[PDB]
Amino acid sequence: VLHLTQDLFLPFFSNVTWFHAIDNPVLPFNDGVYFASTEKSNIIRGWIFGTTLDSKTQSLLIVNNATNVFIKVCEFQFCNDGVYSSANNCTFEYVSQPFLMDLEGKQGNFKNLREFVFKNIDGYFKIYSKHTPIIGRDFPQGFSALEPLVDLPIGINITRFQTLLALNRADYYVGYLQPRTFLLKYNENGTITDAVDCALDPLSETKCTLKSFTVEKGIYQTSNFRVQPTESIVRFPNVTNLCPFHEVFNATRFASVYAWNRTRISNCVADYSVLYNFAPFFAFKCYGVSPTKLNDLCFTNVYADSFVIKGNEVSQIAPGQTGNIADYNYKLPDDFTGCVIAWNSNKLDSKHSGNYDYWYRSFRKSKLKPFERDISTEIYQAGNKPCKGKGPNCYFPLQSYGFRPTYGVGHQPYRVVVLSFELLHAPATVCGPKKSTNLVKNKCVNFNFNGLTGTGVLTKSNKKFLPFQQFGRDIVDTTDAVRDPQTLEILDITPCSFGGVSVITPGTNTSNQVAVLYQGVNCTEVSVAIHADQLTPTWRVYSTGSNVFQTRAGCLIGAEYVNNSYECDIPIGAGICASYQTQSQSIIAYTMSLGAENSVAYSNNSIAIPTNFTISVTTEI
Amino acid sequence: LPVSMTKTSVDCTMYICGDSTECSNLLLQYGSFCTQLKRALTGIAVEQDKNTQEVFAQVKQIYKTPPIKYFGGFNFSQILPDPSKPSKRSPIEDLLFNKVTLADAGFIKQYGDCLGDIAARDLICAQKFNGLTVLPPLLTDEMIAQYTSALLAGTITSGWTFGAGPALQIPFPMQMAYRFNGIGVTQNVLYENQKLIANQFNSAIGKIQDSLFSTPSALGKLQDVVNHNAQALNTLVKQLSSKFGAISSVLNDILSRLDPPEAEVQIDRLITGRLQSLQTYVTQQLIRAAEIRASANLAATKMSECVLGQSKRVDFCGKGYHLMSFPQSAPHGVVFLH
Amino acid sequence: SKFGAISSVLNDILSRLDPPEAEVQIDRLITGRLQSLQTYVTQQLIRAAEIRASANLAATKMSECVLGQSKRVDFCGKGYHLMSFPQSAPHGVVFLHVTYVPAQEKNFTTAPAICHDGKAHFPREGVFVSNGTHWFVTQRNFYEPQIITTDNTFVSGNCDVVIGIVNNTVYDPLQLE
Amino acid sequence: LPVSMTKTSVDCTMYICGDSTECSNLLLQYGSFCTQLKRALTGIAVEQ
Ligand SMILES: *[C@@H]1O[C@H](CO)[C@@H](O)[C@H](O)[C@H]1NC(C)=O
Ligand SMILES: *[C@@H]1O[C@H](CO)[C@@H](O)[C@H](O)[C@H]1NC(C)=O
Ligand SMILES: *[C@@H]1O[C@H](CO)[C@@H](O)[C@H](O)[C@H]1NC(C)=O
Ligand SMILES: *[C@@H]1O[C@H](CO)[C@@H](O)[C@H](O)[C@H]1NC(C)=O
Ligand SMILES: *[C@@H]1O[C@H](CO)[C@@H](O)[C@H](O)[C@H]1NC(C)=O
Ligand SMILES: *[C@@H]1O[C@H](CO)[C@@H](O)[C@H](O)[C@H]1NC(C)=O
Ligand SMILES: *[C@@H]1O[C@H](CO)[C@@H](O)[C@H](O)[C@H]1NC(C)=O
Ligand SMILES: *[C@@H]1O[C@H](CO)[C@@H](O)[C@H](O)[C@H]1NC(C)=O
Ligand SMILES: *[C@@H]1O[C@H](CO)[C@@H](O)[C@H](O)[C@H]1NC(C)=O
Ligand SMILES: *[C@@H]1O[C@H](CO)[C@@H](O)[C@H](O)[C@H]1NC(C)=O
Ligand SMILES: *[C@@H]1O[C@H](CO)[C@@H](O)[C@H](O)[C@H]1NC(C)=O
Ligand SMILES: *[C@@H]1O[C@H](CO)[C@@H](O)[C@H](O)[C@H]1NC(C)=O
Ligand SMILES: *[C@@H]1O[C@H](CO)[C@@H](O)[C@H](O)[C@H]1NC(C)=O
Ligand SMILES: *[C@@H]1O[C@H](CO)[C@@H](O)[C@H](O)[C@H]1NC(C)=O
Ligand SMILES: *[C@@H]1O[C@H](CO)[C@@H](O)[C@H](O)[C@H]1NC(C)=O
Ligand SMILES: *[C@@H]1O[C@H](CO)[C@@H](O)[C@H](O)[C@H]1NC(C)=O
Ligand SMILES: *[C@@H]1O[C@H](CO)[C@@H](O)[C@H](O)[C@H]1NC(C)=O
Ligand SMILES: *[C@@H]1O[C@H](CO)[C@@H](O)[C@H](O)[C@H]1NC(C)=O
């Protein structure tokens, strides 16, 4: 089976800092580390993980001995050389069989290599190892699987990494693994014979895309290429004046719910940290934009509705929800898109001997339409009496919201206010902070123009936008031109750099040399992008100046152009084909020859007649 | 007869999710749903290429007309390539190219001028903005004219022999006599009225050019195929402005407005809508490609019979007793002169 | 494929969640799997239509090339068709088209007609050809020159309108006897 | 030999929603999904 996996795997042909010994530098730990060592008998005992390696954060000791092991999770300080200096509040004392198996055939030349891999995904510390006798030398290059030994869930940050040594009276091979996709060849007995890193060479990505160690001669579309952005211009309008949320919150007379006071917030800059520090929040259930991205969004108009209520009514008021406060006092639209705010206020809506100032409606002739006020004093009708007054079956619509300093939490005076964002696209006014960076008219950039996020390029545009046209668009609904909010100049937005990468390869058995064809994109664009190292493809096809052919189906890289002509071998497109031809061998691209150039000797009395014949047996499938 | 359609390589991931990591992650939860789509579109492209090959590359060797052009009085200058024209085509070939307008040439590498578009970017620039590109056909419109000219020179200088084996030269009046003998009339009558038949042939060839010139659309089938493909692509791109019953229709502002574990529902709604629309497009393209494959196989059989020989089957190679057929290349198709 | 659900196995999904909460996950699986199955069935329909077209082509090819000689050029393989021997193949058929293909040929001076005595002579079948001195009639696809007799030719003309008239002597078997 | 089939002109809007304004409004949220269906059925009729 050719199972494909995505995990933390040491990249093929990476960089390993080979060390020596004769002081024990601390090495960074990130996404796990690959450890390997070859030794005579023993010079290394264990390893130290954690952070700051002191008596402040819990750390890990994996010291072995010839008898068992001593994995533990304790807050030791430093031995500076005892090893369990000030063990301290300890945890997870583990003892098991030794990791270090050493065998000799009555001679010391069997310098067995021990490859160890440690990683700390979601706690659950995993350790892998494998012992293989030497055949020649260091970091031999033959394949070798790694089996797990112990999987103990430590569940602690590990970021530094260190090792122990030995004493009494050529190793330290360390590599750092990366999140990569691998294709692994399994053998009949359940064992890993060969593996290939898909994110390595064009051939590697091709074989991986079809999950087969043998790629037959042909061209195979494997992936796509896009230029990742370098930098990012975020520019907003040219305002700075702070919004009055301070009033909306440093008021006292917040409206009763029967008449919810509604302010409008516009032409200002919203930084909701003031809203945060003006209230020991009790419920911040946003129904529009997340508070995290609240300062990253722009609003055409913002409506702040202030109305004090109680814990039950705080939950009661919500996009199109039931409840007399919601159905007869203040109603939120079913599609409400705004943040609601609720903080406890027992200091402004309470006093000794009580306070019954506030009001709320329980008796209405019908339901409350969203964002519609119903301030009125009309006695509810009961039965069929046109009665106008208080008492039996003639009930006042609105009853007191009486507040005292001593109720239960559900009966406490919760101060509720709400910011009903519009998030339409009309010229914006309340934009959050974000800081305006400058322009970059010709380089692909991630933009956040007035809440509108996206990626592309910006160039000068004569688009005669009439002085009211803003967001702008194209034929099929894709923002094409945004007038710079500050310079009013008009900016077209162009796609980043997309086409498609297809790998042209001969039979892996015939050869491994590969040729890459970026689809429908000029080599110049690819070159300035390859040179700037902003191309998403991590496989860097070799360029020698002689391997660049701007064709009509994009650009071909890794195959030279021979101004001769042959029968097509591998169809590329637009009349060019690539093939494996001798020089001593390489990949050449050529214009396909439609056949042998033949001329007929037609003339007014010349005829050709076969004086002989042949018989042929073709086949049709 | 249509021979091919525009080859498309829509990228599902790009179409359903725009450079959005969470959207791509949630698309991965749909399994190898759309690798099928990429495979099907690749198969369609390869099938179109094979259709063009079957229709046109029917010769074993490249053939060329004699430097002099005197075919017994028959005037053919309207169908053999014109040396003066840079494209090396015929008046009929150009009329055909001038009466068919392609929405997306594909071999333009239009990247770089969407930014210099100044005015609203064209359909193409917009399709590029949402991952729907057009691959160009393997055979260009220039060497396809070379294949057509090779077929033409094979018929007028070697009769139908070159369609079987080696091209044997034979005088054109003699080939006329033999085709006449093929429909039950002696060769003597042709030799007797060779002048009259030559004049009639010249008149008919001349009047077909005016028939194609003055007609609004006699190329209705090819333009219909091109319009169908362009309209399918436009309907594909237009679904990206459809909310599909969610808060908004843009991935970028949806992610920038809702936190991950509530925007998940909306993003899944978009994924379900867009994948369903893409499946609609791919299935319709498969059906139309099967139709075009049938039409192109009919065209290849028609070429192999009417062009490389005389066909006895009545009303197959045009109305009336068939004599010859001169092929002409057309945008995404072939046109016969029976 | 999880299809956006808690897990991808019905057995552990039912064994982990109670019915009226596992309903949503099971419906998500149903929607995913039915859509994938519809994809498969539609693709199989399309491929089966393609195979039906190919098999109808094969049946016509059998009925023509096998059960007879087909005059349609380049249909039963390249060259002048003679026979075709079918052979069974796994999920298909393979034909063995026996074809007649010409060979070595030479330029021959040819004339549309021969004008013996004021009258044009056209070959009953074949081409008039010239070895360089004596004129000869022969077939279409094999050089078998024969003496130009009144049997080989039919006479109809006036030797003034038949373009390519080429004076020469025809023979008759009567004046000798 | 069959020559034609019965020509159908199924109305997606009517089929999915019966004279229901809210249902038609929520169907409009699916975009030009089914204008494709009407176009395909018209093409089938013309082809027959
Ligand atoms: C890391 O390895 C790669 C591949 O062999 C090599 O190109 C690169 O120069 C190496 N880097 C260092 C610092 O050795
Ligand atoms: C080796 O380690 C094991 C486990 O910690 C311990 O039981 C044993 O006593 C140790 N041996 C020596 C010599 O310290
Ligand atoms: C454990 O934590 C307590 C409380 O912070 C601290 O006083 C003590 O020194 C720590 N270590 C031990 C050995 O108890
Ligand atoms: C580990 O420590 C780093 C700071 O050094 C911190 O950013 C990170 O979140 C920590 N991880 C955990 C799991 O605490
Ligand atoms: C250290 O020396 C002692 C005394 O000879 C010996 O028993 C022991 O095995 C030595 N340890 C190592 C690791 O060589
Ligand atoms: C699988 O294991 C058996 C038993 O050791 C061995 O005989 C066989 O050769 C192995 N197969 C392979 C392919 O290595
Ligand atoms: C409003 O803010 C000012 C300044 O921080 C403070 O003095 C005042 O008490 C606040 N008012 C309320 C009601 O929070
Ligand atoms: C509503 O708020 C505005 C702005 O603070 C204020 O001027 C107005 O008096 C308020 N109305 C009520 C009913 O409190
Ligand atoms: C704000 O923008 C307008 C329009 O570009 C400009 O006239 C004005 O001077 C700007 N104000 C500042 C202080 O930048
Ligand atoms: C290709 O395959 C043949 C047969 O197994 C083998 O002899 C040859 O070495 C292979 N070539 C390469 C470069 O793998
Ligand atoms: C791509 O490079 C070719 C090289 O000849 C050049 O002619 C062409 O204009 C370039 N295309 C673009 C879009 O830059
Ligand atoms: C093709 O290559 C030959 C050999 O180098 C060269 O002389 C010739 O000029 C080249 N073709 C063209 C059109 O430049
Ligand atoms: C063939 O015909 C042309 C046109 O009449 C004439 O110029 C030429 O001489 C003729 N050649 C022969 C060999 O008769
Ligand atoms: C015809 O070809 C055959 C087979 O090559 C050969 O044996 C024979 O001599 C040839 N005959 C003539 C007349 O050329
Ligand atoms: C065909 O007619 C055109 C237009 O009169 C003339 O230019 C050309 O020489 C003619 N060609 C032949 C082969 O007679
Ligand atoms: C006829 O003569 C021409 C010119 O020499 C030559 O190219 C051609 O091959 C000859 N044809 C035959 C069949 O002999
Ligand atoms: C053609 O064949 C005849 C047969 O009688 C012979 O007499 C004549 O010389 C030949 N002409 C040539 C070889 O040019
Ligand atoms: C054939 O002979 C007759 C009689 O002399 C003559 O009038 C005629 O022109 C000759 N034809 C040719 C083509 O030489």
Curated annotation (Swiss-Prot), chain A:
Changing Q399N: Reduced host ACE2-binding affinity in vitro. Disulfide bonds join C74-C90, C198-C208, C243-C268, C286-C339, C298-C431, C387-C394, C444-C496, C523-C555, C568-C577. Glycans are attached at residues 15, 65, 89, 157, 189, 230, 232, 238, 250, 509, 522, 563, 582, 604, 612. Changing Q583H: In strain: Eta/B.1.525. Residues 1-210 form the BetaCoV S1-NTD domain. Binds to host ACE2. RBD also interacts with the N-linked glycan on 'Asn-90' of ACE2. Cleavage of S generates a polybasic C-terminal sequence on S1 that binds to host Neuropilin-1 (NRP1) and Neuropilin-2 (NRP2) receptors. Interacts with host integrin alpha-5/beta-1 (ITGA5:ITGB1) and with ACE2 in complex with integrin alpha-5/beta-1 (ITGA5:ITGB1). May interact via cytoplasmic c-terminus with M protein. May interact (via N-terminus) with host bilirubin and biliverdin, thereby preventing antibody binding to the SARS-CoV-2 spike NTD via an allosteric mechanism. This is Spike protein S1. Changing N157Q: Increased resistance to neutralizing antibodies. Attaches the virion to the cell membrane by interacting with host receptor, initiating the infection. The major receptor is host ACE2. When S2/S2' has been cleaved, binding to the receptor triggers direct fusion at the cell membrane. When S2/S2' has not been cleaved, binding to the receptor results in internalization of the virus by endocytosis using host TFRC and GRM2 and leading to fusion of the virion membrane with the host endosomal membrane. Alternatively, may use NRP1/NRP2 and integrin as entry receptors. Residues 226-447 are annotated as: Receptor-binding domain (RBD). Changing T582A: Partial loss of O-glycosylation by host GALNT1. The chain holds residues 47 to 726 of 1273 of the full protein. Changing V26A: In strain: Omicron/XBB.1.5, Omicron/EG.5.1. It comes from the Viruses. Changing N238Q: Reduced viral infectivity. Residues 310-312 are annotated as: Integrin-binding motif. Changing A145V: In strain: 20A.EU1. Changing H425P: Increased resistance to human covalescent sera neutralization. Changing D138G: In strain: Beta/B.1.351. Residues 355-363 are annotated as: Immunodominant HLA epitope recognized by the CD8+. Residues 97-109, 226-242, 362-396, 425-447, 527-546 are annotated as: Disordered. Residues 241-433 form the BetaCoV S1-CTD domain. Changing Q519H: In strain: A23.1. Changing A559V: In strain: 19B/501Y.
